Structure formats: C-alpha cells, structure tokens
A = this chain, B = another copy of it.
Amino acid sequence: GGGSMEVVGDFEYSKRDLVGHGAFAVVFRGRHRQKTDWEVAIKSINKKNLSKSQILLGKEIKILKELQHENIVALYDVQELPNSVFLVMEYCNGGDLADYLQAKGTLSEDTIRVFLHQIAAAMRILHSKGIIHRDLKPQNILLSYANVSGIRIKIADFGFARYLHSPMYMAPEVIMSQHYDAKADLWSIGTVIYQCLVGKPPFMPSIPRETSPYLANLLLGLLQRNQKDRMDFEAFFSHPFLEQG
C-alpha cells in the first residue's frame, strides 16, 4: 500500500488521517464510500505481529459483535487482507479520557457524574452478558462530541475481557477461582473516578475533605483490595451519587 487512499469493504480512509495506535495496530479516521458524511475509525492490525502475540482478536470481535450499546464502541465490519485485519468501528472525535484529563486536569463532581452515568450504563450490559473487561482505564474510555453535556462516552479494548462460566478431572485451583475476578471492573472504575477527581490514581485512600459524602461512599466501596468486601454491581448501578443533581 504505497498509495494515500485505501478501501476496506464499504469504507475507505486516507493514510493522511492517522489518529492513534494500539497493539500491532494503527487507527485512521475513515468514512463509508457512498455515505461519506458517515465517519468511522479503521483499526489496521498486522497479522504476522498478532500471530506471534497472545492477543485473541477473535474473542474481541465476538464480544464487540454481542454488545450493541450507545456507550460501547460500535463494530461495523471486519475485513481480512493478506498482511492486515481491519476493524471498522464508531469514530470517537474526542480521543480517550487520558487526553481529556491531561487537558482539563481534574473534573467537577457534576462532570464525573455525567461520565460515570454513561460508564455505568455500559457496565450494566457487560454484567448482564457476564463479561468482565479487566483492563478498564482512561486509555480505553473514548469520547464523542456533538458540538460537557455534549460528550458521549464509549468503552473500548476488550483485549483482556473474559466471559464468566455460569468436573472431577479439573484442578481444584481452577474449580475454586471461578468468578474470582467477577468484580475487577468495579475497582478499575474506582481508580478512574479517583484520578478524575484528585488528578492522579490513588496508589482506604486519601479522599479530599471537599468530596461530597455520596462520592466518598462510592469511592471507598469501589477501592476495596478484597473483592469479598468490594461493593457489588447492583449497589453501584443504583448508588445515590448517580441519580441526583
């Protein structure tokens, strides 16, 4: 591919419009070839690189396909050239939360609530399909502007995601450790909210005196080293902090 343009099923991109990189991956802004006002992200993935890695792209596609929520990054198409796999995906013109925090610094409780509402919305869908993300972080949380109220949040990167499995020969450590990471996402969402508020990840941790009681409750409930002790999903989904103003 010497040339500037490239065709990927019903979509196309200029190599001029590179927006960022993932693992063995490069992401371009693109568009539908007929509906050209329809912007997409095209993730090019080097096959030889992938085949030498332990990345399960098949799994990521399986999970992306299964999730059709407005706060989970949409997969539109998969194309397989000889040298590359292409994923055609929702364009998120906002970059990731990491960029937004590097710009805005720390966020208001009003802002963090608007964002967390949408992250919670996505967490519902993962929990209800028995998917654990396990690599939630600001690099994985993408932003899409209409024009703070104009900002829509989309979860991405199911590289590390895994399905919960709801046997005499099976090792006891495997039998027992079933569901052991069931609550891993609730911690991560904790560290993320924390960083949004304080301006760095936390490592009970230092909750600033300014913090509202609800938000302090949520954070201390999420940031529990032992999952046994850590807030469960339904408690989080319906936590007072989310459904006020």
| A interface, CB within 8 angstroms of B | 51, 54, 56-59, 61-62, 65-66, 130, 134-138, 163, 165, 168-174, 177, 180-181, 183-188, 191-192, 195, 201-203, 225-227
Chain B hits for A181, CB < 8 A: 171, 173-174, 177
A-B contacts, 22 listed (Cβ < 8 Å)? A51-B62, A54-B163, A56-B59, A57-B58, A58-B59, A134-B171, A137-B169, A137-B170, A138-B169, A168-B191, A168-B202, A168-B203, A169-B187, A169-B201, A170-B188, A171-B185, A171-B187, A171-B227, A172-B225, A173-B227, A174-B184, A177-B180
Chain B hits for A185, CB < 8 A: 171
**Complex Cα distance A56/B65, Å?**
13
> With A173-B227, A184-B173 as given contacts, are A168 and B201 in contact (CB-CB < 8 Å)?
yes
- Of all chain B residues, the one with the shortest Cβ separation from A130 is B54
A235 to chain B, nearest CB (A): 17
Chain B hits for A51, CB < 8 A: 62, 65-66
**Complex Cα distance A181/B191, Å?**
27
Residue pair B201, A188 in contact (C-beta under 8 Å): no
A45 to chain B, nearest CB (A): 13
A219 to chain B, nearest CB (A): 14
**Complex Cα distance A185/B174, Å?**
10
- Of all chain B residues, the one with the shortest Cβ separation from A140 is B169
Chain B hits for A202, CB < 8 A: 168
- Of all chain B residues, the one with the shortest Cβ separation from A56 is B59
Chain B hits for A180, CB < 8 A: 173, 177
Which single member of B165, B177, B183, B201 contacts A177 (CB below 8 Å)? B177
**Complex Cα distance A201/B136, Å?**
41
**Complex Cα distance A55/B134, Å?**
19
A210 to chain B, nearest CB (A): 22
